[PDB]
Design a protein around this motif. Structure first.
Motif, PDB file in Angstrom:
ATOM      1  N   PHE A  79       0.866  -1.241  -0.124  1.00  0.00           N
ATOM      2  CA  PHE A  79       0.203  -0.212   0.066  1.00  0.00           C
ATOM      3  C   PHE A  79       0.959   1.011  -0.047  1.00  0.00           C
ATOM      4  N   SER A  80       0.493   2.405  -0.777  1.00  0.00           N
ATOM      5  CA  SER A  80       1.248   3.543  -0.721  1.00  0.00           C
ATOM      6  C   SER A  80       0.871   4.297   0.404  1.00  0.00           C
ATOM      7  N   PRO A  81       1.802   5.269   0.849  1.00  0.00           N
ATOM      8  CA  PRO A  81       1.489   5.885   1.755  1.00  0.00           C
ATOM      9  C   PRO A  81       0.507   6.898   1.560  1.00  0.00           C
ATOM     10  N   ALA A  82      -0.033   7.296   0.604  1.00  0.00           N
ATOM     11  CA  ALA A  82      -1.036   8.203   0.263  1.00  0.00           C
ATOM     12  C   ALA A  82      -2.359   7.322   0.665  1.00  0.00           C
ATOM     13  N   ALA A  86      -4.974   8.248   3.658  1.00  0.00           N
ATOM     14  CA  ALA A  86      -6.273   8.252   3.553  1.00  0.00           C
ATOM     15  C   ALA A  86      -6.998   7.574   4.383  1.00  0.00           C
ATOM     16  N   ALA A  87      -6.710   6.393   4.719  1.00  0.00           N
ATOM     17  CA  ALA A  87      -7.247   5.473   5.469  1.00  0.00           C
ATOM     18  C   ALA A  87      -7.013   5.589   6.959  1.00  0.00           C
ATOM     19  N   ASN A 114      -8.807   4.640  -4.477  1.00  0.00           N
ATOM     20  CA  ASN A 114     -10.057   4.583  -3.765  1.00  0.00           C
ATOM     21  C   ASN A 114     -10.246   3.043  -3.395  1.00  0.00           C
ATOM     22  N   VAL A 115     -10.210   2.288  -4.176  1.00  0.00           N
ATOM     23  CA  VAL A 115     -10.269   0.737  -3.920  1.00  0.00           C
ATOM     24  C   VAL A 115      -9.454   0.239  -3.046  1.00  0.00           C
ATOM     25  N   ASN A 116      -8.138   0.617  -2.802  1.00  0.00           N
ATOM     26  CA  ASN A 116      -7.101   0.229  -2.067  1.00  0.00           C
ATOM     27  C   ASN A 116      -7.494   0.896  -0.447  1.00  0.00           C
ATOM     28  N   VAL A 117      -7.753   2.182  -0.512  1.00  0.00           N
ATOM     29  CA  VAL A 117      -8.599   2.878   0.718  1.00  0.00           C
ATOM     30  C   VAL A 117      -9.411   1.902   1.396  1.00  0.00           C
ATOM     31  N   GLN A 118     -10.551   1.521   0.347  1.00  0.00           N
ATOM     32  CA  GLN A 118     -11.640   0.643   0.924  1.00  0.00           C
ATOM     33  C   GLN A 118     -11.096  -0.748   1.481  1.00  0.00           C
ATOM     34  N   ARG A 119     -10.258  -1.037   0.753  1.00  0.00           N
ATOM     35  CA  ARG A 119      -9.420  -2.383   1.282  1.00  0.00           C
ATOM     36  C   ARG A 119      -8.870  -2.260   2.758  1.00  0.00           C
TER      37      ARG A 119
END
Ligand SMILES: NC[C@@H]1O[C@H](O[C@H]2[C@@H](O)[C@H](O[C@@H]3[C@@H](O)[C@H](N)C[C@H](N)[C@H]3O[C@H]3O[C@H](CO)[C@@H](O)[C@H](O)[C@H]3N)O[C@@H]2CO)[C@H](N)[C@@H](O)[C@@H]1O
Ligand SMILES: [K+]
Ligand SMILES: [K+]
Ligand SMILES: [K+]
Ligand SMILES: [K+]
Ligand SMILES: [K+]
Ligand SMILES: [K+]
Ligand SMILES: [K+]
Ligand SMILES: [K+]
Ligand SMILES: [K+]
Ligand SMILES: [K+]
Ligand SMILES: [K+]
Ligand SMILES: [K+]
Ligand SMILES: [K+]
Ligand SMILES: [K+]
Ligand SMILES: [K+]
Ligand SMILES: [K+]
Ligand SMILES: [K+]
Ligand SMILES: [Mg+2]
Ligand SMILES: [Mg+2]
Ligand SMILES: [Mg+2]
Ligand SMILES: [Mg+2]
Ligand SMILES: [Mg+2]
Ligand SMILES: [Mg+2]
Ligand SMILES: [Mg+2]
Ligand SMILES: [Mg+2]
Ligand SMILES: [Mg+2]
Ligand SMILES: [Mg+2]
Ligand SMILES: [Mg+2]
Ligand SMILES: [Mg+2]
Ligand SMILES: [Mg+2]
Ligand SMILES: [Mg+2]
Ligand SMILES: [Mg+2]
Ligand SMILES: [Mg+2]
Ligand SMILES: [Mg+2]
Ligand SMILES: [Mg+2]
Ligand SMILES: [Mg+2]
Ligand SMILES: [Mg+2]
Ligand SMILES: [Mg+2]
Ligand SMILES: [Mg+2]
Ligand SMILES: [Mg+2]
Ligand SMILES: [Mg+2]
Ligand SMILES: [Mg+2]
Ligand SMILES: [Mg+2]
Ligand SMILES: [Mg+2]
Ligand SMILES: [Mg+2]
Ligand SMILES: [Mg+2]
Ligand SMILES: [Mg+2]
Ligand SMILES: [Mg+2]
Ligand SMILES: [Mg+2]
Ligand SMILES: [Mg+2]
Ligand SMILES: [Mg+2]
Ligand SMILES: [Mg+2]
Ligand SMILES: [Mg+2]
Ligand SMILES: [Mg+2]
Ligand SMILES: [Mg+2]
Ligand SMILES: [Mg+2]
Ligand SMILES: [Mg+2]
Ligand SMILES: [Mg+2]
Ligand SMILES: [Mg+2]
Ligand SMILES: [Mg+2]
Ligand SMILES: [Mg+2]
Ligand SMILES: [Mg+2]
Ligand SMILES: [Mg+2]
Ligand SMILES: [Mg+2]
Ligand SMILES: [Mg+2]
Ligand SMILES: [Mg+2]
Ligand SMILES: [Mg+2]
Ligand SMILES: [Mg+2]
Ligand SMILES: [Mg+2]
Ligand SMILES: [Mg+2]
Ligand SMILES: [Mg+2]
Ligand SMILES: [Mg+2]
Ligand SMILES: [Mg+2]
Ligand SMILES: [Mg+2]
Ligand SMILES: [Mg+2]
Ligand SMILES: [Mg+2]
Ligand SMILES: [Mg+2]
Ligand SMILES: [Mg+2]
Ligand SMILES: [Mg+2]
Ligand SMILES: [Mg+2]
Ligand SMILES: [Mg+2]
Ligand SMILES: [Mg+2]
Ligand SMILES: [Mg+2]
Ligand SMILES: [Mg+2]
Ligand SMILES: [Mg+2]
Ligand SMILES: [Mg+2]
Ligand SMILES: [Mg+2]
Ligand SMILES: [Mg+2]
Ligand SMILES: [Mg+2]
Ligand SMILES: [Mg+2]
Ligand SMILES: [Mg+2]
Ligand SMILES: [Mg+2]
Ligand SMILES: [Mg+2]
Ligand SMILES: [Mg+2]
Ligand SMILES: [Mg+2]
Ligand SMILES: [Mg+2]
Ligand SMILES: [Mg+2]
Ligand SMILES: [Mg+2]
Ligand SMILES: [Mg+2]
Ligand code: NA
Ligand code: NA
Ligand code: NA
Ligand code: NA
Ligand code: NA
Ligand code: NA
Ligand code: NA
Ligand code: NA
Ligand code: NA
Ligand code: NA
Ligand code: NA
Ligand code: NA
Ligand code: NA
Lengths: 214, 144
Positions: A79-82, A86-87, A114-119
């Motif tokens: 996962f990126s720091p951004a 956001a998470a 957004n998909v990774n933030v939801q993950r």
RNA sequence: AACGUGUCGCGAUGGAUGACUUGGCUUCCUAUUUCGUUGAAGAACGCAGUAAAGUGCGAUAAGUGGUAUCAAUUGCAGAAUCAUUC
RNA sequence: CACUGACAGGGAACGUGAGCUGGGUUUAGACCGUCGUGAGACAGGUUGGUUUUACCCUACUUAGCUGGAAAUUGCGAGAA
RNA sequence: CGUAAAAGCUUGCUUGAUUAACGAUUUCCAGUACGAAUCGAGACUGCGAAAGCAAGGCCAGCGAUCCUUUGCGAAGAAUA
RNA sequence: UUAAUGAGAUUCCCUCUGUCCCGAGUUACUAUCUAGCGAAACGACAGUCAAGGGAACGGACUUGAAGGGCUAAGCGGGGA
RNA sequence: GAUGCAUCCAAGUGGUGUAUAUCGCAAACUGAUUUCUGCCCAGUGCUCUGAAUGUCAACGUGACGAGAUUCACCGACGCG
RNA sequence: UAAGCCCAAUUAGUGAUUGCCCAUUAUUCCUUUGGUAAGGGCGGAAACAAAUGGAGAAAGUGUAGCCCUUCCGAUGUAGAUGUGGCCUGGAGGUUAGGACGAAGCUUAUGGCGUGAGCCUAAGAUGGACCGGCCUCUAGUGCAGAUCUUGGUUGGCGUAGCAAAGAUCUAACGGAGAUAUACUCAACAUGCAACGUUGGAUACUGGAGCGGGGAAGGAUUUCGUGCCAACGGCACUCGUA
RNA sequence: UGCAAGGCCGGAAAGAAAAGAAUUAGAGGCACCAAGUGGGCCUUCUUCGGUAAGCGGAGCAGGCGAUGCGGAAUGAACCGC
RNA sequence: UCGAACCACCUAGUAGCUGGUUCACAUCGAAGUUUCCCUCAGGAUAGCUGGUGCUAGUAGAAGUAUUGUGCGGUAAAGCAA
RNA sequence: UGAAAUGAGCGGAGUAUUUGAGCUGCGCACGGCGCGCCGCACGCACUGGUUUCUUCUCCGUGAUGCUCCAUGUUGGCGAUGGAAAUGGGGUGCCCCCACCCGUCUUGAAACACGGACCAAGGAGUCAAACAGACGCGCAAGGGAGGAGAUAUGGUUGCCAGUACUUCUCUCGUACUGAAAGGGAGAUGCAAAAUGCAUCUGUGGUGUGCACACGUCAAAUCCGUUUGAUUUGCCCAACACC
RNA sequence: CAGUGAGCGGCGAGCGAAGAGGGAACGAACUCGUUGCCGAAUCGGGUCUUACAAGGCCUUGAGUUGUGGCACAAAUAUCAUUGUGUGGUUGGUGCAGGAGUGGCGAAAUUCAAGCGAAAAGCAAACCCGUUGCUGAAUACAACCCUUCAUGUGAGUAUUGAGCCAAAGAAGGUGUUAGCCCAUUGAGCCAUAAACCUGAGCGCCUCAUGAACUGUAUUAAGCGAGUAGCACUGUUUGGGAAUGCAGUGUCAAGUUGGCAGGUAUUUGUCUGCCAAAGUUAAAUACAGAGUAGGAAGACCGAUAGCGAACAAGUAGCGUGAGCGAAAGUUUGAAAAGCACUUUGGAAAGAGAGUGAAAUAGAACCUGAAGUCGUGACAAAGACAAUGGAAGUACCUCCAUUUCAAC
């Protein structure tokens, strides 16, 4: 005779074969079933040692590159720091609770992030954090009842908490609109292709014409 | 299996089908593809014309992924539509939507008569295919 | 006649064949598994009551010590104990 | 050259090398001439240069033993 | 071998010794190339009053891959 | 060109002789026989000839002529 | 004539003739003495204290060009 | 008075037109095998115990071939292909054998098969494994490569064991003798060869088969015992 | 309305008479995958070089090679088969 | 052991050349010729041959006649053409 | 040796039957002479007549048997023996045949090479690429492979197997151009520099399995079936477009 | 991907990768230099604390020609002050459980039948069968006939009756063994350290995180004979040059640099930030070792390693090196042949052991070839062998027949 056969290109002219004078250069797979069993045995042993932590750390979803695979989705490195910010997760703390961090991957589109933030959000909601001292629980740490109730993911891709990679839903059947009825798809596509393909020559021709005017 | 070979049949035949005069020698013709222009020219020319020489431009560092462009014709579009959607598909009504790139196709070609009208999402399309699908009642929508 | 020839029975010479297999070859796996100036690997000479080779050992020399085992070793000979440890 | 009645021509794997001889020819040494840029070459000359084995079978030469006329048997019987 | 108001000689005009949309075929022959040929189709021509006759001198006179080198893809027009 | 020198190549003469005419006799050690000991080479199968044909030079084949068996010492015609 | 000639050596403040120094060292040929060793530098070699000389490389110098590139000039043993 | 040459006949001027002998050829008969093979049968017709007509009948490439009838071909180097074709080691199945004798081995042991081979019999052979069938599998079949290894073998009791001269005699020692059916006094029926000592004859001839050393060897040195193997003959002797 | 060509619709067909007036152990065509061979030799007729050759070299066709059997006493090629 | 020593390895070096190449029966069965090749003791390539077949079993049949219709310049003949 | 005796031959029935030869009727052919006259060896039709000679004539048994095997007479030998027979095996002998194997070669018995005996060993193998034939699965789709998953997180071992999974990969369903890049249905109407309309359809023609209409000929045990052929569709294929 | 419609190649023979995609592995990341702010806060050496403590005290010994601290994109001060904690990887100190390692540890017949011949069978799927039936071995022993002798090793076999099985596992034991032996399971016991366990659990000591409020910040930099470039050489599929090497020449960082597979000069765009360093797993073990296991459609003593055995041994070569042959496999047990007799001895002839001595000693089985012997068959000289037909004689072979058959 030789007859009508394919022209051979078998490429076996080096000292590949082991013999009385050559050590050879070969690779056999006779140990393949044994290595498969050993790898599974090691994974089970690893799961026992790291219990109750999931065997595979959480990984993000990424889009495969190239025009051939851009429709496919798969797991990325980390996962990126951004995405982590956001998470609501500090990246250094995230690495301590089973989240893979990749500081190299950029986020060039909102949908990709957004998909990774939801993950991450789903994983954070399902996370049970064992207290460092089960006598003095700090905020965020789990209760004793949840500690005894904890179980281990152990799934191959480590995706039980968040689910498999998400693909776009197929479009539902519908009727043809009036514009699609009358519009020439090939002419539009060919014109756009010709704009890029002949961009250099068209620009030079216009410049030569402008120089002719002056 | 070894028991099915001509060697079993040739036990006791001495020469094993290779002759008394010519015999089975080591390399009577040269090794591999030697003599392609000398003493084997007739074989190479009559069975593999075009083998020798150069042709065309060079493309250093070929990458096949950018060049990926599989094609499917109009008469094969039923392979990408479920049977229930095909039955309910009628001209002038609700039609199934085919996503070619998710199905592994990049260009719609348009050979033959289309069997079931549908909406096709394609990266490329031939002009005849685009004309025929609109005449049949379907449509083509560009995708990427 | 005699040498010599042929056959059968029985012997000799000669160690094939079968059965046997504590060996080889080949493929896998396990791991607090990788020597030496704190003198290694290798080489030499010795060590048993009886002992050439081999094996083991190093003037403490077919071994000292400790733990476990629980009545031997064995060609001959020798040997306190016939045994909770000593 | 000489004798003689006469000094005819030939063949026998151009008889005959496990019979001999080894002068010649045809190795390696070396000299000369000619030839070749050269290494070298020459039915050109020259000098020097290992000639192995029979006890086998036939043949021949001699030397011994010994059957045998249904030429070993039939008893199958023929007398110059 | 063929040819006599020519296929020879003389002369008047010429450049059919150019180009020729990968047409087909003969000779060699494996029915492969190469070289020579044959019958065309199209362009532009020459000669002739005209039917016509010519894309060399009838039939020998010649050359793959790779590489080198030259010619052609003139100018301007097209919202593609 | 050359005295001296040479296990160097050549010619003649004296002496000398079994080199030869032309062979003979003798001796030691062999061979030969015996006691003891005891091999190798070689070995398709085998082993009498004449002619004929035949891969044009047969021990096998055709047609003839020979051929009782087994042995000892020699011998070098053949066994291409 | 040693700051050398011949020359070992993969290489060094490496090695040999050289512990030497032209009556020396290194490289060829002929082959005692005696008597002699003629003519030829065209060729092939070797060599020269012969040119303001043609040609031969890299380096250098200058220039056209946006630059790669290119061009001009210079250029030694050797050969001529 | 051809058994030679040329011609001409087939039992001869009689009455008609096949003298005789030899093929892997022809005709025909029997059998095998293979076809570009040709046909027929295959819905068990009925009936039928033993003591006292039978048996089979498979819808099938190929087998002991489902059976029967019919026709044609059949050689062959190099080479191709086929074979309910043969054989060997091992594996998956199945079905058996063996201490009342497995494997292996032996044969004037026969039987079967065109053949590769299979099976039985005997062993006055052996002593513990092993056969058939379907499938799988491979380091799977030998007469010969101046083939490899081991053994054997004719030559053959043969060639030979001949340089360095040469040995003889008695006694003692030793199993190595003076070793005997009958006859018969001893010769003609125990030969040959030995170690030591004393004699005899000769050799080496001091550049020695003399006496000491190096190199090399390493117990060959010495005494006692001992004769299996070794000292190419011999040994009672020996550097065994 | 002729000619050239590609078709359509009908007609007639000793299915090929007679005159010596064919015959056939004549299933025609089409593929696919491959082996051995690519030293030949002999003979009747034709035939070239050579004095000639059991010599060299060709044509048509048979034969040996690859094949014995019956004959020419014997002979790879001759005769018969 | 020398006109390039010996030892081990690369090395089972390569060989169009020589030699060898292990059971049976059955159905078929050659070629030594064409073209190309540093080709001439070897190969490719057609032909010959086997196997697999395919196709509606006389269909596009013939190492042979007959009839009709073409082609020829060898044997002969000629030099009085 | 009659386990279907197909017989001119066996079984019944009856002195007849019609072959030929002789002898002859009419017509026609045939021959000689130049219009119809003569002859006619005895040809053709009346299946002429005469029966003088020469013949035998007619009728008769299916398989209710799919196949194979099984039924005489007279002596000799054989009456259970260490017997008699037949076959096999062994050794010798007669008469006639018969050159040594393997190999190269146009040609070997060769004065061409390897060839004293025996035992054991001893030579077309494994892997990869392609192709064709044949077997099997699926089919416009086929198939992995690597890896996971758990029966198996179990068991000395059987279990290095078997069972299960894959938005992938790969070969194909599309081919062309040096490339930039383009990319294949039919019919009808009509000729638009992307023409319109329809979608149950071999693009057309020639030759061509089966099948369907009929139609002839041969044979039927009268149920049919063996060929050929007309027409239609023509499958697979082949040839022109 | 891919033997590649990449490319390299007398573009001949041949050669030949890379990105993407499915996966394995993965708690995977860190350190220095530089820059800025600090400036001995550092390192050794003594000495004490239970301690060569990541600790205190001391020390010019090293070091300012710079040790060390803090911050740099996973970032958004440090630096006190108090409370809340944490560290078994700070060093002492001592307390557990486990794993690992070693030792120990299971069932059921030596049941019944005795010997050359019943310790054998038959009743033809299944059952009747927990039953019925019984004997062609009055055997055999070598030309036949008498007389007198002689001969059957050990039952893991057979039949009958049972039994164990969470154990049927395959080794041993005089023949083929689930129940004769060993083995095959739960489980028990004992442990230097290390390893694993609320980063196992305490004490001293030493370090250390977050939240408190006050507290001084934005400014700079980030690796040079290095990268490039020329010549040469090599390497690569890398082709106007993929990597590297020698020499020459040598930067940029205020239009920064490198990469973007056709050279040049330009202008854009994309990714990245070389010339310092550490780092576990997935991978190799193609002639290695240590300690153990599992095995095999493999070989079976001329095979398989050269070596089943006093084998890298004997032997060979000056040496480098070369390098065998050989299963002692008698028997169930040595019971390994006492004793007599002949012989100098070796051995012979007897006698014994044993089921077997033709199992007698490096001895199971004992082939082929060759040889000896007895019996027989004959046979001139055609070298022998061979083929086809008979015949003579022989035959421990096969089959048939023996009464109206
Ligand atoms: N009889 C003639 C020959 O017999 C030979 O073979 C004979 C032998 O090999 C074979 O072996 C016999 C055996 O039969 C007989 N019944 C017992 C005898 N022990 C065996 O003999 C064997 O063993 C003895 C010692 O026991 C040895 O001496 C002898 O060499 C050995 N062959 O008996 C065969 C007789 O039939 C060959 N096969 C052959 O050369 C030839 O025919
Ligand atoms: K061919
Ligand atoms: K993407
Ligand atoms: K040949
Ligand atoms: K001579
Ligand atoms: K010399
Ligand atoms: K001399
Ligand atoms: K090139
Ligand atoms: K002198
Ligand atoms: K004769
Ligand atoms: K002089
Ligand atoms: K038949
Ligand atoms: K069948
Ligand atoms: K043979
Ligand atoms: K002998
Ligand atoms: K002494
Ligand atoms: K001796
Ligand atoms: K057992
Ligand atoms: Mg805690
Ligand atoms: Mg053959
Ligand atoms: Mg072949
Ligand atoms: Mg060949
Ligand atoms: Mg040849
Ligand atoms: Mg080009
Ligand atoms: Mg010792
Ligand atoms: Mg001491
Ligand atoms: Mg004790
Ligand atoms: Mg002469
Ligand atoms: Mg002569
Ligand atoms: Mg001689
Ligand atoms: Mg001679
Ligand atoms: Mg001479
Ligand atoms: Mg001379
Ligand atoms: Mg000469
Ligand atoms: Mg007599
Ligand atoms: Mg008499
Ligand atoms: Mg004119
Ligand atoms: Mg053309
Ligand atoms: Mg011309
Ligand atoms: Mg001309
Ligand atoms: Mg012309
Ligand atoms: Mg001299
Ligand atoms: Mg010989
Ligand atoms: Mg003669
Ligand atoms: Mg001879
Ligand atoms: Mg002679
Ligand atoms: Mg001179
Ligand atoms: Mg002189
Ligand atoms: Mg007459
Ligand atoms: Mg045949
Ligand atoms: Mg095997
Ligand atoms: Mg015999
Ligand atoms: Mg083999
Ligand atoms: Mg053999
Ligand atoms: Mg002698
Ligand atoms: Mg003598
Ligand atoms: Mg003497
Ligand atoms: Mg002598
Ligand atoms: Mg006496
Ligand atoms: Mg005496
Ligand atoms: Mg003297
Ligand atoms: Mg002396
Ligand atoms: Mg002594
Ligand atoms: Mg002696
Ligand atoms: Mg007619
Ligand atoms: Mg004859
Ligand atoms: Mg080889
Ligand atoms: Mg060749
Ligand atoms: Mg050969
Ligand atoms: Mg034939
Ligand atoms: Mg040859
Ligand atoms: Mg003439
Ligand atoms: Mg004329
Ligand atoms: Mg004239
Ligand atoms: Mg009658
Ligand atoms: Mg009968
Ligand atoms: Mg020849
Ligand atoms: Mg031949
Ligand atoms: Mg021969
Ligand atoms: Mg001859
Ligand atoms: Mg020859
Ligand atoms: Mg030869
Ligand atoms: Mg092919
Ligand atoms: Mg295709
Ligand atoms: Mg591919
Ligand atoms: Mg390479
Ligand atoms: Mg990668
Ligand atoms: Mg610092
Ligand atoms: Mg009991
Ligand atoms: Mg007897
Ligand atoms: Mg940097
Ligand atoms: Mg640099
Ligand atoms: Mg590293
Ligand atoms: Mg296993
Ligand atoms: Mg052995
Ligand atoms: Mg061995
Ligand atoms: Mg060995
Ligand atoms: Mg015995
Ligand atoms: Mg007799
Ligand atoms: Mg006989
Ligand atoms: Na060929
Ligand atoms: Na024209
Ligand atoms: Na040219
Ligand atoms: Na002759
Ligand atoms: Na001199
Ligand atoms: Na001169
Ligand atoms: Na000169
Ligand atoms: Na016959
Ligand atoms: Na027949
Ligand atoms: Na002849
Ligand atoms: Na078990
Ligand atoms: Na024998
Ligand atoms: Na005998």
């Amino acid at each position: 005779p030789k007859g009508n056969n394919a022209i051979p290109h078998v490429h076996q002219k080096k000292h590949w074969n082991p013999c009385s004078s050559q050590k050879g250069n070969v690779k056999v797979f006779l140990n393949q079933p044994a290595q498969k069993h050993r790898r599974r045995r090691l994974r089970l042993l690893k799961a026992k040692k790291v219990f109750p932590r999931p065997l595979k750390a959480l990984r993000p979803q990424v889009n495969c590159p190239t025009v051939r695979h851009n429709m496919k989705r798969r797991l990325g490195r980390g996962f990126s720091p951004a995405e982590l910010k956001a998470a609501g997760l500090n990246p250094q703390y995230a690495a301590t609770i089973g989240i893979r961090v990749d500081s190299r991957r950029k986020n060039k589109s909102e949908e990709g992030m957004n998909v990774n933030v939801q993950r991450l959000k789903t994983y954070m909601s399902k996370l049970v954090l064992f207290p460092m001292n089960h006598k003095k629980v700090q905020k965020g740490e789990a209760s004793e009842e949840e500690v005894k109730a904890a179980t281990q993911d152990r799934s191959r891709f480590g995706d039980a908490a968040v689910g498999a990679v998400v693909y776009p839903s197929a479009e539902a059947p519908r009727a043809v609109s009036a514009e699609e009825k009358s519009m020439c798809v090939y002419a539009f596509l060919k014109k756009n292709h010709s704009a890029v393909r002949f961009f250099g020559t068209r620009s030079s021709r216009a410049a030569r014409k402008e120089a002719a005017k002056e | 299996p070894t028991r099915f070979k001509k060697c079993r049949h040739q036990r006791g035949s001495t020469f094993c089908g290779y002759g008394r005069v010519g015999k089975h020698r080591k390399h009577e013709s040269g090794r591999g593809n030697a003599g392609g222009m000398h003493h084997h020219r007739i074989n190479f020319d009559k069975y593999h014309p075009g083998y020798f020489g150069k042709l065309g431009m060079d493309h250093y560092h070929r990458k096949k992924n950018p060049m990926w462009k599989p094609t499917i014709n109009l008469n094969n579009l039923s392979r990408l539509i479920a049977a229930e959607e095909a039955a309910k598909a009628a001209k002038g009504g609700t039609l199934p939507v085919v996503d070619l790139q998710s199905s592994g196709y990049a260009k719609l070609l348009g050979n033959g008569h289309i069997q079931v009208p549908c909406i096709v999402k394609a990266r490329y399309v031939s002009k005849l295919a685009d004309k025929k699908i609109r005449k049949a009642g379907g449509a083509v929508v560009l995708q990427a």
